[PDB]
Scaffold this active site. Structure first.
Site, PDB file in Angstrom:
ATOM      1  N   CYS A   1      34.901  58.125 -24.530  1.00  0.00           N
ATOM      2  CA  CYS A   1      34.703  57.556 -23.200  1.00  0.00           C
ATOM      3  C   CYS A   1      33.286  57.037 -22.931  1.00  0.00           C
ATOM      4  O   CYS A   1      33.077  56.096 -22.115  1.00  0.00           O
ATOM      5  CB  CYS A   1      34.964  58.623 -22.140  1.00  0.00           C
ATOM      6  SG  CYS A   1      36.661  58.854 -21.810  1.00  0.00           S
ATOM      7  N   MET A   2      32.310  57.683 -23.574  1.00  0.00           N
ATOM      8  CA  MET A   2      30.925  57.299 -23.362  1.00  0.00           C
ATOM      9  C   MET A   2      30.387  56.317 -24.372  1.00  0.00           C
ATOM     10  O   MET A   2      29.183  56.028 -24.410  1.00  0.00           O
ATOM     11  CB  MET A   2      30.017  58.529 -23.329  1.00  0.00           C
ATOM     12  CG  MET A   2      30.300  59.466 -22.159  1.00  0.00           C
ATOM     13  SD  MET A   2      28.928  60.869 -22.059  1.00  0.00           S
ATOM     14  CE  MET A   2      29.348  61.803 -23.676  1.00  0.00           C
TER      15      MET A   2
END
EC number: 3.5.3.6
Lengths: 404, 408, 404, 408
Positions: C392-393
């Site tokens: 996600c990052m």
């Protein structure tokens, strides 16, 4: 004849109901959730609708007992009042500085008015000028904070007590506030004429004990006949209660089998997803019922606790069919989230193929009619503004058996 | 020195805490809410931080009692185990067909292990194989039923909740949620059969696990013996007038207090120690939004009354009232929390626990409030909040003072 | 070499990330939900943790691009600023009486500070004394009512743009407020040096159009290699977008197949329940993944819309296995609501069998290690205080292919 | 007479309403929330009550336009259908493989049926059998995906929401929820190609379906042309400052108004007409809790300003301000709603729609407020609320005044 419920579809001879009243008058959008009631209703219309329901059963010769009347009469025996008040008005529930005034004032009231307050609750405002009342009034004004809380769920007489064959359960409710309702009904079964001198057994439950994790609710209990009892196990009826209820019925020979309908998992009782309409016909919310896991619980002499349990192989609908000596059940599906959506479950059967349901459920009622059932309807605008219908609003007391 | 708590800022001599443990190992995103706990925490890390917290108080001379230690000691007394199991294992709590096998297995455990299970719960899987145990597994598997024969009590970590020492007497609090009464049952067993307590002298002001308290509820975070004969008790969603009145009446009956100031919280459930906390003799942290709205009520003993006390609403702010009650012109006040507001990042520095006047234990993350506390003269010892403060925690909720010196 | 992502596990050469910053500084318990972020975090610690994450990838030779830096440089080209500001500051978003002051003030700022405000938002308080600012300040004080809203989700660079083989998608986000993030990233891909002169295709998406019910989110998109692309269809990525995305990839020959992972139904993206760690290894939240319905979408010349769809017979895990020419996938289960519970899904793979995950997920990390994977860990105290992890990052930009 | 609304209590001459219908037939307990509607209603009964409502206004001489009627007429104009379908059926809204078959089926329908589908939505099942349609069914069956090619618009019943006639000009409101913009698209098509409108003279103050309005949102329940050159506009969760400013600036630009009073609602989303309603020249119903806290702001045109207006916070209550703005010493006020409070049962009598001064249409259930309204001099015509008011309904939300006479 003797008090007792022998099936779900046999001729209904005596039933208990409770009309909407003062409790509902105390409802506000802001106090609904804490009063464990879905929404605010138009009280006077709700009363007219409940009356029409009561009148429709009476016109077919059913003896319909209304809780407010029974309470009003019970309360006329000094001993019964005392018994309720001793348990209902304590330091822990009302507060140190209010028990004495509150009880003196309640005790001075006329029978029917006192009964309406026991079910509809008491507000600081109802009390005669006093300091206590005044402090309460302060907390309400200054802090937004009832001496006696209203019991709007009494309207659903099925919840708190259950007549299973020649006996009744005094159900240890899930939410503690609702135990107040079981308290008043127990006073009625104890002291009222219709009950005090009648032969029947108390299978389980007692308003004077704690029960802890043992909880049972009416909607989950059904004495279907043939010595069988269906009991739903879900968010509101626990295994701890069900086992004690079964052991008691077995110990007295009142039943041969208890079929545990294991509900998967929003709290739901068996009767909101499953209901009888005739000897071999049932409505069903397919989504839940097909997932029910049936467990058979039977009397067993070679066991420490006197019973044994077996998960059944077949579906719940097949298990119930066989337990009644039926080849199969005819099934009418309803609910589901065909002009429009409706959930016609929870009708209350007056006799085989004669049912009372809500006017709005047109599709489902049409299926029930096509299936050979006479459907008497009442208005649901206020009565069924949220949960439960006819089944939820009735507590059968005398219902004849049906057959093999 | 005699047991008893005489202020909020006096020198803490003895405290009870409870380390996160097995109870938390059982947390799951789906059973969280039902176990009345905010979220799943990294248990091994929570334990290391808890130990740093404990070690930082002990290193300063404070006797710190660990609930697991106390309970393991207690249950070595046969009469105390029995007292506990008689009340915790019944057909109503566990089911007709599980009581004997469950009681027998527990009684066959080693003290330390037994105590971890009493606080941490028991799953069907923990039992020796058997018919009764297999059906529970089946309920859990086929129906998704929780599998806990004995529910876990992750909230034990907040020792402040279940019992309050008010001037040399303690309250065995009747919690709002019935499930949490299982914590009080165990803490009461300790206060009853444990050496540090059985032989000490102290009063039991209010409470009792063997009785149903109906609508009378009291939670630790709401109680505060600020001293000078005064006691602050918050009244909101968790502490009811019905309890508060009996606690006061009991305190007055033995003259353990001159006044009880009822802090009327308006209206999300919150205790007093959550929006208001002492840091020094004349210093307090505050969540303005709530505090500026607390309605104060003075409850004093009164012989010309049938029920023995009088009640008076105060017209001055709750802060001015606490001030006047402690012999001060004004309390110094540090504002925190806000959900709106001047500063680099939001934080809530309420709930620090005071070790001595001007010495406090707080959370590392509340950097803003922590430095406003230092500028105001307080030494702030910090601990990690990643796991412990993963919700409503706080050093104050995590401590149950047993011995705290008076101030002035 | 050329920009492009050719698999989920190949050597990662260039990735984009975005550190926590001003946006998160503006977070309060009361504004979290409207800012579409789970909770308030300890910003400075979050920054140190994100930095440690960035440093761990760099130390292994990965080129790590940080969004604030890229934005700061893009913004130094007058045309790029103008392009962003023209779209970001209008009467409709800021208000009639504030567009001019707000833009003049933003335009006077130094590059890096201006970039921090474009991502961290602007409060009335940041503005130089003015009537406008003052009225806003009034609404806040008197009514509890940001000129420019903070974009705390920029930290999750995977959400807004996706590099699929030799191209990228500019994802039309579900929540309108999040389209502000796709706007800034598009400015970067348009005007920044690393991108302006690089060859790549824009497969789908455009910050200047509406897209309506067409929505796509990074977590659902995975170019797994072998001409295949996995795209999850659930609460955040719609069939309307997926079809247009597939048609575009097909039209350019960029892909042979798109496998639609149909998620059942709480919003979840494919990458939160399914992730790669090696050529043939994946973590999985059994509960969802076993219910995924796979649909194969392929280029078809005999069709009006140029493609045809087939529901696959086998499980999703078998479908993905075969599409990579693998006999089967090795699977590590995680999540589920064994010392304790943990959900080790969403790790970001740096190269085959080398993964970055969170320190708390000890059980799962142990399984990944036992399965032959090297697990580098970073702190999740603030970064993973709610949703998403490494995957996600990160927004991969250059990732080498793997094999058959 | 010229189109236009000049007060809240003047004689209503023309109104638009929309009967519950197919949209509601599609409601389900699980798709309710996503369709932004409070609950499943008994549709056939709702229709009978709606018709009684319509019949009670018509019987009094009021021209009452039914949205279904207007839309069926409109779409008979080829250019108007096209205008509507060009914007409602696209690859983004419906999907690449459904646009042509869906557009062809719709265009092959009879006008009345077509209009019922435009407002009531289209399910995969309604299409002639086909590949594209079968896959949607499959998504719905295997994944539980909603099956609506075209979502239903049950909120059409509240004609007040999407367009406001303010003194002879109308606003095509940009709704808060993107889904609801589909209603405005259809109402705009009517105002554009329908005989009753295409040829009439009126201004389009604000709004436009072909543009994205970003953070500028306006909802009908917040707008009130009370007359005397004044316009009340509520500002809360649904009407934003960004919209309000442009609406005002547009009104001032043509001199259609002298003042705009911004009713600042504090903080559950609520519109002004939900807590405040006119019944007569000097009479209004009110939900005290909210009204006593509304912050008023006067917005007047101002040539010595770059953006053409000035804004001033008012120091007197919103009620005193509305009073002064209408040339009155004081408004007579009837309190209702409360969620706490003297009377037999709780009720909320706000949202009645006025037909003429002192003549109002209300709900049968609000017996208390209805009689306090009668004692205050108002004739209250009642309709059934069982289905229509099964939530946030009300006669005011169910009417969109087109022609309303001024007062004084």
């Amino acid at each position: 004849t003797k008090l007792g419920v022998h099936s779900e579809a046999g001729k209904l001879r005596k039933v208990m109901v409770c009309s909407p009243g003062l409790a509902h008058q105390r409802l506000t959008p802001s106090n609904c959730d804490e009063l464990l009631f879905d929404d605010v209703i138009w009280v006077n219309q709700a009363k007219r609708d409940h009356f029409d329901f009561v009148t429709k059963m009476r016109e077919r010769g059913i003896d319909v007992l209304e809780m407010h009347n029974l309470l009003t009469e019970t309360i006329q025996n000094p001993e019964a009042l005392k018994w309720i008040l001793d348990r209902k008005i304590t330091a822990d529930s009302v507060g140190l500085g209010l028990t004495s005034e509150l009880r003196s004032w309640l005790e001075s009231l006329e029978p029917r008015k006192l009964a309406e307050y026991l079910i509809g609750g008491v507000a600081a405002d109802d009390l005669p000028a006093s300091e206590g009342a005044n402090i309460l009034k302060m907390y309400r004004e200054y802090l937004g904070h009832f001496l006696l809380p209203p019991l709007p769920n009494t309207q659903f007489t099925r919840d708190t007590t259950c007549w299973i064959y020649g006996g009744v359960t005094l159900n240890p409710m899930y939410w503690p506030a609702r135990r107040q309702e079981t308290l008043l009904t127990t006073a009625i079964y104890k002291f009222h004429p219709e009950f005090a001198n009648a032969e029947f057994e108390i299978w389980y439950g007692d308003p004077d004990k704690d029960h802890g994790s043992s909880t049972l609710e009416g909607g989950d209990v059904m004495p279907i006949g043939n010595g069988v009892v269906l009991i739903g196990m879900g968010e509101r009826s626990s295994r701890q209660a069900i086992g004690q209820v079964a052991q008691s019925l077995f110990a007295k020979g009142a039943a041969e089998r208890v079929i545990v309908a294991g509900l998967p998992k929003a709290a739901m009782h068996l009767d909101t997803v499953f209901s009888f309409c005739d000897r071999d016909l049932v409505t069903v919310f397919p989504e839940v019922v097909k997932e029910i896991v049936p467990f058979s619980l039977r009397p067993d002499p070679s066991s420490p606790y006197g019973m044994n349990i077996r998960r059944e192989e077949k579906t719940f609908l097949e298990v119930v069919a066989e337990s009644l000596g039926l080849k199969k059940l005819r099934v009418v599906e309803t609910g589901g989230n065909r002009e429009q959506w409706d959930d016609g479950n929870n009708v209350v059967c007056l006799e085989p193929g004669v049912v009372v349901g809500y006017d709005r459920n047109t599709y489902t009622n049409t299926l029930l009619r096509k299936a050979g059932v006479e459907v008497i309807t009442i208005s649901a605008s206020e009565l069924g503004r949220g949960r439960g219908g006819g089944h939820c609003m009735t507590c059968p007391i005398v219902r004849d058996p049906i057959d093999y």
